[PDB]
Amino acid sequence: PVNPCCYYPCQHQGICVRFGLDRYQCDCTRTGYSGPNCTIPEIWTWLRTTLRPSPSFIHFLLTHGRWLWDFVNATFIRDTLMRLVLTVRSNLIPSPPTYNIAHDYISWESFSNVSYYTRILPSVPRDCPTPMGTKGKKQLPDAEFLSRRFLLRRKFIPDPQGTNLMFAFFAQHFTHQFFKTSGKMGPGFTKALGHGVDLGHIYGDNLERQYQLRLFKDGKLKYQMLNGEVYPPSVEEAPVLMHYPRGIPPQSQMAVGQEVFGLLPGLMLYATIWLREHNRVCDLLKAEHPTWGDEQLFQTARLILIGETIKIVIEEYVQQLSGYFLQLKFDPELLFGAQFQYRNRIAMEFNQLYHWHPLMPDSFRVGPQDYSYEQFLFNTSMLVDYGVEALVDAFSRQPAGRIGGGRNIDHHILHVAVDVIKESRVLRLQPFNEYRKRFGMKPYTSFQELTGEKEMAAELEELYGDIDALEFYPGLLLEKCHPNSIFGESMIEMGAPFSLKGLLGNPICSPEYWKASTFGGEVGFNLVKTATLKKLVCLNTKTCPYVSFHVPD
Amino acid sequence: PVNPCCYYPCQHQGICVRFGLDRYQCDCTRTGYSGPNCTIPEIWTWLRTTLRPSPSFIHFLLTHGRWLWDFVNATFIRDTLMRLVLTVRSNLIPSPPTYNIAHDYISWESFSNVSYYTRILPSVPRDCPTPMGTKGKKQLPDAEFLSRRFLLRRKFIPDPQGTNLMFAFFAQHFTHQFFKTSGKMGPGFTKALGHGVDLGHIYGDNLERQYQLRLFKDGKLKYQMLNGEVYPPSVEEAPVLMHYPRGIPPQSQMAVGQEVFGLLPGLMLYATIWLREHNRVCDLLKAEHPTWGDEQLFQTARLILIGETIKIVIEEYVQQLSGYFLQLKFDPELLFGAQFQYRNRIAMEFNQLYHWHPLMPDSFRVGPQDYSYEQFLFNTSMLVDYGVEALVDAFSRQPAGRIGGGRNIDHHILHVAVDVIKESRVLRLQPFNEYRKRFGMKPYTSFQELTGEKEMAAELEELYGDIDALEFYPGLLLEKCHPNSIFGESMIEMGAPFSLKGLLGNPICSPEYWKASTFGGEVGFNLVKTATLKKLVCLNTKTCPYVSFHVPD
Ligand SMILES: *[C@@H]1O[C@H](CO)[C@@H](O[C@H]2O[C@H](CO)[C@@H](O[C@@H]3O[C@H](CO[C@@H]4O[C@H](CO[C@@H]5O[C@H](CO)[C@@H](O)[C@H](O)[C@@H]5O)[C@@H](O)[C@H](O)[C@@H]4O)[C@@H](O)[C@H](O)[C@@H]3O)[C@H](O)[C@H]2NC(C)=O)[C@H](O)[C@H]1NC(C)=O
Ligand SMILES: *[C@@H]1O[C@H](CO)[C@@H](O[C@H]2O[C@H](CO)[C@@H](O[C@@H]3O[C@H](CO[C@H]4O[C@H](CO[C@H]5O[C@H](CO)[C@@H](O)[C@H](O)[C@@H]5O)[C@@H](O)[C@H](O)[C@@H]4O)[C@@H](O)[C@H](O)[C@@H]3O)[C@H](O)[C@H]2NC(C)=O)[C@H](O)[C@H]1NC(C)=O
Ligand SMILES: *[C@@H]1O[C@H](CO)[C@@H](O[C@@H]2O[C@H](CO)[C@@H](O[C@@H]3O[C@H](CO[C@@H]4O[C@H](CO)[C@@H](O)[C@H](O)[C@@H]4O)[C@@H](O)[C@H](O)[C@@H]3O)[C@H](O)[C@H]2NC(C)=O)[C@H](O)[C@H]1NC(C)=O
Ligand SMILES: *[C@@H]1O[C@H](CO)[C@@H](O[C@@H]2O[C@H](CO)[C@@H](O[C@@H]3O[C@H](CO[C@@H]4O[C@H](CO)[C@@H](O)[C@H](O)[C@@H]4O)[C@@H](O)[C@H](O)[C@@H]3O)[C@H](O)[C@H]2NC(C)=O)[C@H](O)[C@H]1NC(C)=O
Ligand code: HEM
Ligand code: HEM
Ligand SMILES: *[C@@H]1O[C@H](CO)[C@@H](O[C@H]2O[C@H](CO)[C@@H](O)[C@H](O)[C@H]2NC(C)=O)[C@H](O)[C@H]1NC(C)=O
Ligand SMILES: *[C@@H]1O[C@H](CO)[C@@H](O[C@H]2O[C@H](CO)[C@@H](O)[C@H](O)[C@H]2NC(C)=O)[C@H](O)[C@H]1NC(C)=O
Ligand SMILES: CCCCCCCCO[C@@H]1O[C@H](CO)[C@@H](O)[C@H](O)[C@H]1O
Ligand SMILES: CCCCCCCCO[C@@H]1O[C@H](CO)[C@@H](O)[C@H](O)[C@H]1O
Ligand SMILES: CCCCCCCCO[C@@H]1O[C@H](CO)[C@@H](O)[C@H](O)[C@H]1O
Ligand SMILES: CCCCCCCCO[C@@H]1O[C@H](CO)[C@@H](O)[C@H](O)[C@H]1O
Ligand SMILES: CCCCCCCCO[C@@H]1O[C@H](CO)[C@@H](O)[C@H](O)[C@H]1O
Ligand SMILES: CCCCCCCCO[C@@H]1O[C@H](CO)[C@@H](O)[C@H](O)[C@H]1O
Ligand SMILES: CCCCCCCCO[C@@H]1O[C@H](CO)[C@@H](O)[C@H](O)[C@H]1O
Ligand SMILES: CCCCCCCCO[C@@H]1O[C@H](CO)[C@@H](O)[C@H](O)[C@H]1O
Ligand SMILES: C[C@H](C(=O)O)c1ccc(-c2ccccc2)cc1
Ligand SMILES: C[C@H](C(=O)O)c1ccc(-c2ccccc2)cc1
Q1: Third-level CATH fold of B2-42
Q2: Interface mutation vs chain B, best among A209, A512, A514, A525, most B CBs within 10 Å
Q3: What one-character DSSP code corresponds to residue A23?
Q4: Which of A28, A204, A516, B489 has the most CB atoms less than 10 A away?
Q5: Rounded to the nearest 5°, which phi and psi values hold at B163?
Q6: Residue A546 catalytic?
Q7: Is B270 a catalytic residue?
Q8: Helix H or strand E encompassing A230
């Protein structure tokens, strides 16, 4: 008897439950539909769906008519729309979280064990006829072949939106505080127990590590002086585990919150900027609160930096990424009248979607000098040799690669995409089309509709055999991009919900925490409300270089 | 310079923050008040407080006019009132949680480290003129003296509401799933990381322990047969750490989720009933779902038992406790249209408040036999000797002692109260009157007003010197009791918020989880919806004895 849930019979988030030896029932509770497979719409459900413009038309509206948007952005309409965006996008993510790699049903273990990444759609049943369920071949295309054929970069394709490396390293630094897959436990497990913006990549993901990194004086983080400049301390003064190639002297190993940041100067660059921001904030707090001890100074600075991070990510990072003329706004109060849960659980699908390796260039240009991957990766003297300002200027000037479209991952890191595809199969992620529906989009009827071209589509069709067998990650990177965009609609329609839910679901955005006293008063609250990338760098450097998420003109 | 916040200047939940060397500022954000101390009301705030009837009057309305409540309870008005109770009570509890024993301010560590009990009011600053702030003497009364003088029972005082031992043991059993203070870490720390109704007292507070307790067959829990009846397994069969006096071998110990349950037959009685219920539910689930494996049967049954627990607690436990003519109702759907966070963090004040030792009798009567504490405590055969039905019948017929009013704690366990008072001082809990205000009541102006009498009031007055120096726990237990009630208004006004928040804050009550599929379908969902104390017992025993939370008429 073939497992009926392998046919993915339940639609619109209805829940498929096996009954008896060969039957099944769909739980349509609060889905807005009824019927055996939750396909019969209620009045409002129908109106909403038949009158709702497509993601492509909305994307069009949001990226045209700057004159009208400039007007709108200066009115209450800016808040009305930002609220709509926030609520409509986040409503797609279940909270409290539902499934994980071990349970394809709600359970107390899935709810309480935070070492697990959560998941939005259950896994493909292990007893299905094919790897993807019912469609496709008995064996999926070879991961290595799939990557070399469709993901490997031939000629560098720059992001048409003007995104640069300053943005690419920001994204890598930022996401690594919540994507920390455990090697020991395996796929489906994380070590970033904070499941969000807790800044564990600065303060450490565990208490013992945090303590080794702290100076325990004035609430500050340990540091060292080099060429009269402030940098993270060496592992000798802050005995913390760091992932460095064997043979590298401890004196040349910098100690920071995230163990893998010694991998790239671009990562240590941000680690340095934030470390300096932390100590700088500590100084501001101390002047305002001379009676405070080291602990409160440290904890309050952390909250301020968390706020500064969310602010910059929404108003500058996501702004650059979206390309929207609507001025995004970070304002927790926009949700104080709505039903919203201030909690977040990182999804394995979100982890998959954020592998933006295509952003990395062919080489790294620092002034007249061009540096190869071998001169850049694990280079422990570049940051100190050039200093923060020089690297920020350089990264802000060099363009990053386009993410969507295919064939744009540098050969030096193509192996990551290969492992991502392999991980996807161990996690038994459902097919791309099931995720399209889960996120409110119509499934693609053919590979041609997906890619927008004919040659790659024909080859994919031969390899997968059926569009309904196309996998999650390949689908995301091979989907045709929006006009002049960094990526396709699925990346936005699927990524926006996870991202927004992750940003606003932070406890500091709750009515309980979002108050001046939480940040030490008006001074600290204002630091959060008015934070910018430019201020983050220039208030912590001797000179002010060109700083931005987009290349200059 | 005296610490300005030692005077507890900020009112109505305003937050006191130290500025400069000797100044302070109150953050009145969203309190509904403004001004230096958060005392100037906004028009609506004033309107609401002036029209608000007193807790005494509302208590009067809820305990009179049966004819009217009989009409109300059979209509939608019952639901309207329950929702009001729910939202208004839970709104007094901060969520996300605020402080803990280490931080008297919001911090990321307080939010993320669940080993800490949270707290509603910050601690008494360590640099205050007196132990309670600025009022009272430089030295608090001796804890032992206080207990002997005002808490020690002289003549057993039965609860006037008819509460029995079946209720007392249920309460002790139930609360021990979320109150597990860590001896190793000390005051302020808990081992019950679930912080709520997770049934960890049945399944264990950690995974390793849960695995030792499970049969891994049919989703069931290990068990043993004795005299043809089902009981928890021995430690020899389920090797988990149980706290038994030294010398008692593993084969003679019973292994259950909570390590301290071997202490009393009353606790193991409930451990036995719930274990039978778990396995009984597994049977019903397997009949409906023959394809389900052991893990899903186990997890689903746990969710059902959690649901049955909350149902019984709200509609029978709290109902008995309140004495309201209003028929309380457990219906998560009542909050779906409101703003509510589905999370809970156990407060140290709630732990203190729940020390209901006065409930325990002078001796334990089982039919013709009367057992002393010496014969009852640590008795390893009584449960099996009498069987479940017999003990339930016996406990359901024996009256429990009155909680409030004072002088009603059996000398055998008075030492617990002494330690609660000592613990309170290590935690530096603010005075009783500060808590009265935090929970919407007027502070008491004298001990006479507090106790309602003159003898104890005069002595307390001399020991403490000032009503504003009275401590939390002593205050709760010495407050005058409502007419014919089990305890005073403070117990209700402070206890209800914590209780209701903890019950409805459970994720199974969220819109995401409260669906039939979560419980395996309609059969499991109805088990939750129609759960009853009588059914919990009678469907798991050979015969059906007298079972209730109140003695028979
Ligand atoms: C979050 O969730 C993850 C995933 O579940 C947790 O992972 C870890 O915990 C699991 C449970 O501890 C680990 O499971 C392994 O199970 C192996 C098999 O053991 C079996 O169970 C008992 C073993 O006990 C037996 O009897 C005596 C009794 O004392 C015992 O001393 C003796 O050793 C004997 O084996 C038995 O019934 C069976 O026959 C099996 O032996 C273990 O051998 C192994 O050590 C481990 O416990 C799992 O591997 C862990 N890691 C991962 C990645 O899964 C994680 O702990 C959870 N986190 C939290 C905070 O809950
Ligand atoms: C939830 O919250 C609780 C409460 O904070 C927390 O408690 C435990 O964790 C902390 C931190 O691990 C424990 O700290 C204890 O105090 C001392 C700290 O002082 C010393 O620490 C270092 C000593 O060892 C190191 O010294 C050399 C330097 O010469 C260094 O090179 C080596 O690395 C070496 O290991 C040192 O840096 C410093 O100078 C001091 O000597 C700890 O050392 C000690 O081990 C203690 O552990 C608490 O005691 C823990 N329990 C309690 C009750 O506080 C929980 O861990 C937390 N839970 C979670 C999940 O976060
Ligand atoms: C970690 O990063 C540091 C950078 O801080 C690396 O050190 C730097 O390495 C560069 C390249 O080896 C050094 O180059 C300098 O400038 C010229 C560059 O070459 C010139 O341009 C092209 C290239 O051949 C030709 O057309 C020109 O004729 C000319 O050759 C070089 O010739 C100079 O000799 C000089 O070295 C740079 O000086 C150096 N910086 C410092 C402070 O050492 C470092 O190698 C890297 N570590 C590792 C292990 O890769
Ligand atoms: C754990 O609990 C069990 C009960 O489940 C304890 O065992 C039981 O102990 C009682 C008394 O200790 C035994 O009593 C039986 O019946 C009479 C009762 O006494 C009578 O009533 C009064 C009392 O003096 C007098 O007026 C009468 O003359 C008469 O004495 C007793 O006399 C009998 O000898 C008989 O023991 C009961 O039988 C026993 N149950 C079993 C099956 O063992 C057990 O002690 C306890 N463990 C500990 C450590 O206390
Ligand atoms: C040239 C620079 C880069 C190098 C050397 C690099 C490297 C790596 C390696 C070695 C891994 C782990 C692979 C495995 O376990 O198989 C990884 C993972 C990952 N990378 Fe990159 N990467 C780069 C850039 C970036 C960028 C710019 C982003 C975009 C935000 C990013 C995102 C991620 C994510 C989300 C993961 C998974 C983390 C996890 O599960 O722990 N990377 N990368
Ligand atoms: C036969 C009677 C009982 C005995 C022997 C007993 C005993 C004890 C002991 C020995 C402690 C721990 C004290 C310490 O660490 O200093 C404790 C705690 C506790 N007891 Fe009782 N008790 C009884 C009844 C009850 C009842 C009826 C309730 C009410 C629901 C209750 C509730 C509590 C609570 C809430 C704690 C604190 C738990 C914690 O923080 O871990 N007890 N008791
Ligand atoms: C509900 O979903 C099922 C599952 O795909 C649909 O398919 C079933 O019913 C068909 C109608 O006759 C049969 O032809 C299929 O063999 C049968 N498949 C399975 C797995 O049982 C079903 O038609 C859908 N019903 C509705 C109303 O949409
Ligand atoms: C605000 O609260 C403070 C603290 O309770 C009040 O007390 C301060 O001001 C009084 C005015 O005469 C003095 O008598 C007190 O000594 C002084 N105490 C402190 C904290 O320094 C204050 O009156 C209140 N003010 C308002 C506006 O209500
Ligand atoms: C009510 C006024 C409607 C005007 C119709 C505007 C037409 C915009 O049309 C849009 O063009 C895009 C490409 O430029 C496509 O990607 C979108 O799918 C399409 O809807
Ligand atoms: C309330 C929010 C309204 C957002 C609507 C913005 C959409 C801008 O729409 C623009 O209108 C222009 C009309 O002169 C056209 O010429 C542009 O092609 C079109 O994209
Ligand atoms: C927070 C929910 C508010 C519902 C009010 C109805 C207003 C409908 O609002 C619509 O929602 C769509 C998404 O479903 C958007 O794509 C449309 O642009 C928006 O106008
Ligand atoms: C014209 C301006 C419109 C502003 C509203 C945009 C925000 C609504 O965004 C909508 O979110 C939904 C759920 O994730 C998606 O299914 C829709 O395709 C998307 O347009
Ligand atoms: C029509 C509305 C009338 C509002 C009158 C406001 C009454 C509250 O008045 C306030 O009472 C506090 C406590 O006694 C004082 O500390 C404040 O200074 C006082 O303004
Ligand atoms: C009996 C009259 C009651 C009036 C209710 C006051 C409503 C709140 O009024 C507010 O007062 C603030 C302080 O001056 C102003 O800054 C705000 O603009 C104003 O809206
Ligand atoms: C909608 C909620 C209404 C709550 C009101 C219930 C209060 C019952 O009130 C009772 O009414 C009786 C009338 O016969 C009086 O005799 C009692 O003294 C009075 O306490
Ligand atoms: C007549 C029936 C009334 C039902 C409403 C009772 C529920 C509201 O209860 C109220 O909760 C507040 C916050 O905890 C307390 O401050 C009030 O004193 C209390 O009466
Ligand atoms: C505002 C806009 C929307 O809601 O449309 C939006 C929000 C978030 C992202 C995002 C961020 C990170 C990864 C992937 C996607 C993209 C667009
Ligand atoms: C419904 C009623 C109300 O909200 O009035 C209520 C709710 C809860 C308790 C309670 C529970 C445990 C300890 C202490 C108190 C008491 C009364």
Answers
A1: Laminin (2.10.25)
A2: A512
A3: E
A4: A28
A5: -60, 135
A6: no
A7: no
A8: strand A229-231
